[PDB]
Design a protein around this ligand. Structure first.
Ligand code: CLA
Ligand code: CLA
Ligand code: CLA
Ligand code: CLA
Ligand code: CLA
Ligand code: CLA
Ligand SMILES: CC(=O)O[C@H]1CC(C)(C)C(=C=C/C(C)=C/C=C/C(C)=C/C=C/C=C(C)/C=C/C=C(C)/C=C/[C@@]23O[C@]2(C)C[C@@H](O)CC3(C)C)[C@](C)(O)C1
Ligand code: KC1
Ligand SMILES: CC1=C(C#C/C(C)=C/C=C/C(C)=C/C=C/C=C(C)/C=C/C=C(C)/C=C/[C@@]23O[C@]2(C)C[C@@H](O)CC3(C)C)C(C)(C)C[C@H](O)C1
Ligand SMILES: CC1=C(C#C/C(C)=C/C=C/C(C)=C/C=C/C=C(C)/C=C/C=C(C)/C=C/[C@@]23O[C@]2(C)C[C@@H](O)CC3(C)C)C(C)(C)C[C@H](O)C1
Ligand SMILES: CC1=C(C#C/C(C)=C/C=C/C(C)=C/C=C/C=C(C)/C=C/C=C(C)/C=C\[C@@]23O[C@]2(C)C[C@@H](O)CC3(C)C)C(C)(C)C[C@H](O)C1
Lengths: 160, 180, 132, 215
């Protein structure tokens, strides 16, 4: 399996044991959807780890009923136990309307990261290649940095 | 076509019309569309008058029972309901609304829509047409369409303007400039 | 030709079958067939030969898509469950009445949406089964 | 015979019908049941290598045609679907009963006892939201895999065939899926027996002589 937007500059078909059968195109398509979704979520999560620190936490409350404030929710893994769980349920609802609105069954465009977002799309198939591989490489670096920040918060006891 | 050929979807730039309906209510409810335009034009007219009535009293106020008239916009309404001014305004507006809209809309105005249904009196053509001041219309269809578009644009602008004005006045107070 | 009794029964069967298949069409014009009595409403057949409900059974929202109805019913279910829970158990409103203060209108308005969610999800499945 | 209309249930010439869901076409079920039972996964050595169904619960759908020509009793396909679902739910329930007593995850009230955790999480303001999320997720994954039509033996899907197989199973040339299905079914029955034992111990102490100190 080559040409599938996965081989980059400092690396090739990086599989110490990945793609164990070196086939099973259905498994590989599922893994492609998995990796692209993981990368997008990670990029967002690292983004949201480094936004509150470099740009002060939101000015509002985030909970008028529970008297919580944005400036009172700690940044990092501790926020999961501070954000009101109705808020996490609403985040789950947004994830649902973001996952179940458009189908992502195998074969469908949803199974290839094609959720019709565009906005930062391009025009030429080579420019398409550039944008897609940029997104994928940034997502891999994201995943790495996001689990790194997870462990930094877990061990150091704070955001950094 | 889009929205049954109603006026209001025109964009400012060119023949590339706006046709703003992200949720697609016009396509989902084409037979309820005259009602939608009736509501839109009514809200726009009420909002024009409401923004003008938020601005003007900051300049000149009628002499009255001194509790409703000598008050700010945000706290006017309660005192005016108490003074008996807004109750007479409600009598006037209710008579106008019942007769005009409830008879142009319901073929049996002596019956609620649960019993009459129908609601065929509101056609697409006579949506905002209450036959009031129709002699002031230009005598050509193109400028009639342009004037209707002007009314709709100013009505939407007045809706948003009144919403912002009342929200800022509640937040801050002040007069015509509702800034902090 | 010495018509048989079985031939007479055959003619009776033919007459009954022809009448039955003929009175259905617009050539009998009886009060039963008037719109809102027995027929299926002109342009809105509710179900076909197979007893599968068509999108016409939804009425005004006969063209609201399945995804939109699913979102509508899920939001209504969530809001109604929140209102019901906040009215009955969490911050009970009857106990608030016992405190001398009025109800919270938000809870009642929210809890009003549960049967909305019920009929909305039924309509959502009707739309999904019709490909809408 | 009787005309095309006026045909309901016991009238001669009435083809059996099955349309419980408003929005789905009418389905006409054949008896089957016994025919599907004769070629059905299960029936291992523990009961003599034959399909152990005393009381004839798999034959009642065939007897529906004799009782009232109505789908009152489930098809054997529905019985296998229910057995699979019960087995999976009981596996999870057994693991949960023996994991809640030692582990705690969320902001739920601390209740190691399994018989009280459900109610105490109902009462929790920050437990009701979580249980609502669990309920909506279960409802989604249950209505998506509605089966339901297995009640009359036409499910178009083998029992317990939700859209869930992250590993390479059901696709590898090896790993005979018949043995995996038999293992799943038998472990599910075992987990159901275990859950029944847990309930009996909770109600009648000393019933199962291995969970005497258990909740
Ligand atoms: C759970 C997360 C996840 C998942 C599902 C995948 C999945 C995939 N990666 Mg991958 N990757 C990840 C995390 C992940 N990656 C991270 C964190 C890094 C950074 C170290 C990489 C770096 C990486 C490289 C450098 C390459 C892949 C490639 C691949 C694809 C083929 C290899 C394979 O089967 O791996 C399972 C496959 C779609 C290869 C590819 O796209 O094919 C050319 C490839 O060259 N990955
Ligand atoms: C994986 C994606 C993800 C997740 C789970 C969160 C989750 C969270 N963010 Mg966040 N954020 C994200 C991406 C994400 N963010 C991105 C991409 C940005 C850049 C625009 C931000 C910028 C941001 C700010 C500026 C703030 C949060 C805050 C928060 C917390 C309160 C909930 C809220 O209002 O969210 C939003 C919550 C833990 C608030 C908080 O409590 O601070 C830690 C807050 O003030 N986020
Ligand atoms: C556009 C519709 C809409 C509306 C009306 C609301 C309304 C609300 N949201 Mg919200 N939300 C929405 C969309 C919406 N949301 C979407 C799309 C997301 C995901 C991006 C969120 C994510 C979100 C979080 C994370 C939180 C809320 C919360 C709240 C509530 C704060 C008031 C309070 O203290 O509890 C009454 C309020 C009822 C907060 C909440 O429920 O606190 C209890 C909270 O923490 N929301
Ligand atoms: C009371 C508010 C109200 C109502 C009822 C309408 C109604 C309408 N607008 Mg409209 N509009 C409004 C406010 C309103 N507008 C405001 C404030 C703006 C400024 C942003 C606009 C800008 C606007 C544009 C640019 C266009 C319309 C159009 C339309 C028509 C088709 C869209 C539709 O069915 O939506 C019905 C809307 C509602 C039922 C309101 C839902 C409110 C939710 C629940 C909140 C319809 C008659 C289109 C048109 O004229 O087609 C020819 C069109 O292109 N509107
Ligand atoms: C309610 C759960 C349930 C369901 C629907 C089924 C369904 C089925 N089983 Mg099954 N089974 C179960 C639980 C269940 N099983 C449990 C817990 C065990 C362990 C003892 C078994 C052991 C078992 C064997 C060994 C065999 C089957 C077989 C079958 C199939 C034909 C039998 C039939 O029609 O019974 C369906 C109808 C019922 C099960 C009715 C159950 C209601 C009764 C009245 C409850 C009484 C129990 C009561 C609580 C006392 C507890 C006793 C204690 C041991 C727990 C069918 C698919 C046969 C097969 O695979 O055929 C190919 C077969 O050989 N089952
Ligand atoms: C009034 C009864 C009723 C009816 C007619 C329907 C009808 C429907 N439901 Mg539904 N549902 C019901 C109750 C009902 N539901 C209840 C009570 C819940 C739990 C809150 C749900 C949860 C639910 C979900 C989560 C989904 C459906 C879906 C559907 C649609 C297709 C799939 C299906 O039927 O599988 C579901 C079948 C059932 C739930 C069987 C319910 C049988 C009822 C409860 C009678 C039980 C009585 C007992 C013997 C204090 C002495 C269909 C229109 C699906 C949908 O929207 O389309 C894809 C879907 O995903 N239902
Ligand atoms: C027979 C007979 O009788 O003939 C009749 C027939 C008929 C048809 C009735 C007639 C008519 C027409 C009428 C009555 C037309 C009146 C139209 C009005 C009053 C329009 C007001 C718009 C105000 C707007 C857009 C406000 C906009 C405000 C904005 C954008 C404000 C915006 C901000 O406030 C906000 C939102 C925040 C503030 O802090 C700052 C600023 C920027 C100022 C006749 C011809 O006359 C007579
Ligand atoms: C990335 C977004 C996200 C975060 C950050 C997040 C976090 C938490 N989720 Mg959550 N979640 C989703 C999204 C997210 N969840 C999605 C898409 C689903 C559907 C698959 C889902 C499902 C459930 C369920 C079923 C439960 C649940 C809860 C908690 C919980 C504990 C709170 C606490 O104990 O205070 C925390 C911190 C459990 C709970 O205890 O709620 C009272 C509960 O039962 N979640
Ligand atoms: C933002 C925010 C939050 C958040 C968040 C979220 C959602 C964070 C998300 C984190 C996320 C998404 C973490 C997963 C990463 C995926 C990984 C690590 C995959 C690795 C996979 C690897 C390393 C595999 C590499 C392989 O080499 C192997 C092994 C075999 C090779 O042949 C093939 C390849 C190259 C593939 C909180 C926590 C909710 C609160 C906070 O306050 C605000
Ligand atoms: C104050 C007071 C009272 C009162 C009151 C009243 C009347 C309160 C009224 C409040 C009111 C009327 C509040 C409006 C909000 C408008 C909103 C949110 C519009 C958003 C509109 C948005 C966000 C539009 C965005 C876009 O347009 C953009 C920017 C470009 C377009 O291309 C696309 C769209 C259209 C999406 C009482 C009760 C009478 C008595 C009491 O004693 C005192
Ligand atoms: C048009 C027409 C004709 C006509 C006509 C004419 C002249 C029509 C005129 C109708 C007219 C002049 C109708 C007045 C209504 C006044 C209502 C006031 C209510 C006031 C109220 C309800 C308020 C009372 C209080 O405020 C008080 C006073 C003190 C406050 O402290 C307390 C309250 C708020 C309770 C013809 C020519 C005769 C026949 C032709 O064919 C058709």
């Amino acid at each position: 399996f080559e040409n599938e937007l996965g081989v980059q500059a400092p690396t090739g078909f990086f599989d110490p044991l990945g793609l164990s059968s070196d086939g099973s195109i259905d498994n590989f398509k599922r893994r492609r959807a998995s990796e692209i979704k993981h990368g997008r979520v990670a990029m967002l999560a690292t983004m949201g780890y480094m936004t509150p620190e470099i740009t002060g936490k939101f000015p509002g409350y985030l909970s008028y009923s529970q008297s919580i404030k944005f400036a009172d929710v700690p940044n990092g893994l501790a926020a999961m136990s501070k954000v009101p769980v109705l808020g996490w349920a609403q985040v789950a609802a947004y994830g649902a309307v973001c996952e179940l609105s458009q189908d992502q069954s195998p074969g469908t465009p949803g199974a290839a990261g094609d959720f019709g977002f565009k906005v930062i799309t391009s025009e030429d198939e080579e420019t398409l290649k550039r944008k897609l591989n940029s997104e994928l490489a940034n997502g891999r670096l994201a995943m790495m940095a996001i689990i790194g920040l997870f462990f930094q918060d877990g061990l150091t006891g704070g955001a950094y | 076509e889009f929205a049954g050929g109603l006026i209001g979807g025109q964009s400012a730039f060119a023949s590339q019309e706006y046709n703003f309906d992200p949720l697609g209510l016009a396509e989902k409810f084409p037979e309820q569309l005259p009602f939608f335009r009736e509501a839109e034009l009514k809200h726009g007219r009420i909002a024009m008058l409401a923004w003008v009535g938020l601005v003007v009293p900051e300049f000149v106020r009628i002499p009255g029972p001194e509790k409703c008239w000598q008050a700010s916009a945000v706290d006017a309404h309660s005192a005016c309901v108490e003074t008996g001014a807004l109750t007479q305004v409600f009598i006037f507006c209710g008579t106008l609304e019942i007769c005009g809209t409830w008879a142009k809309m319901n073929p049996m105005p002596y019956l609620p829509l649960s019993q009459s249904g129908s609601t065929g009196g509101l056609t697409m053509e006579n949506a905002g047409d209450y036959r009031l001041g129709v002699n002031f219309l230009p005598d050509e269809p193109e400028k009639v369409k342009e004037m209707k578009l002007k009314e709709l644009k100013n009505g939407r602008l007045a809706m948003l303007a009144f919403g912002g004005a009342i929200t800022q006045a509640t937040l801050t107070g002040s007069g015509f400039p509702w800034l902090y | 030709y010495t018509e048989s009794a079985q031939d007479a029964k055959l003619f009776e069967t033919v007459f009954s079958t022809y009448t039955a298949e003929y009175l259905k069409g617009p050539m009998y014009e009886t009060p039963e067939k008037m719109i809102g009595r027995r027929p299926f409403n002109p342009g809105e057949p509710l179900w076909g030969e197979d007893k599968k409900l068509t999108s016409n059974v939804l009425g005004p929202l006969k063209r609201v898509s399945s995804n939109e109805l699913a979102f509508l019913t899920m939001i209504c279910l969530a809001i109604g469950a929140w209102g019901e829970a906040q009215f009955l158990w969490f911050d009970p409103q009857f106990a608030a009445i016992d405190r001398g203060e009025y109800f919270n209108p938000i809870y009642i308005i929210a809890a009003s949406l549960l049967p909305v969610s019920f009929w909305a999800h039924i309509a959502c499945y009707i739309q999904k089964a019709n490909g809408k | 015979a009787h005309p095309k209309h006026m045909l309901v249930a016991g009238v001669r010439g009435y083809e059996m019908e099955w349309q419980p869901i408003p929005g789905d076409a009418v389905k006409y079920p054949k008896p089957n049941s016994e025919e599907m039972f004769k070629t059905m996964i299960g029936a291992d050595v523990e009961t003599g290598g034959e399909a152990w169904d005393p009381l004839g619960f798999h034959k009642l759908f065939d007897r529906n045609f004799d009782f009232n020509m109505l789908p009152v009793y489930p098809h054997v396909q529905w019985l296998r679907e229910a057995e699979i679902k019960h087995g999976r739910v009981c596996m999870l329930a057994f693991i949960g009963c023996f994991a809640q007593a030692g582990y705690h995850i969320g902001s739920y009230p601390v209740q190691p006892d399994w018989s009280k955790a459900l109610a105490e999480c109902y009462a929790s303001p920050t437990g009701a939201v979580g249980l609502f999320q669990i309920s909506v997720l279960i409802g989604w994954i249950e209505g998506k895999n509605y089966n339901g039509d297995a009640w009359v033996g036409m499910s178009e899907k083998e029992p317990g065939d939700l859209g869930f197989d992250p590993a390479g199973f059901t696709k590898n040339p090896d790993f005979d899926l018949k043995k995996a299905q038999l293992q799943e079914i038998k472990n599910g029955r075992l987990a159901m027996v275990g859950c029944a034992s847990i309930a009996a111990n909770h109600f009648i102490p000393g019933s199962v002589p291995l969970l005497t100190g258990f909740y």
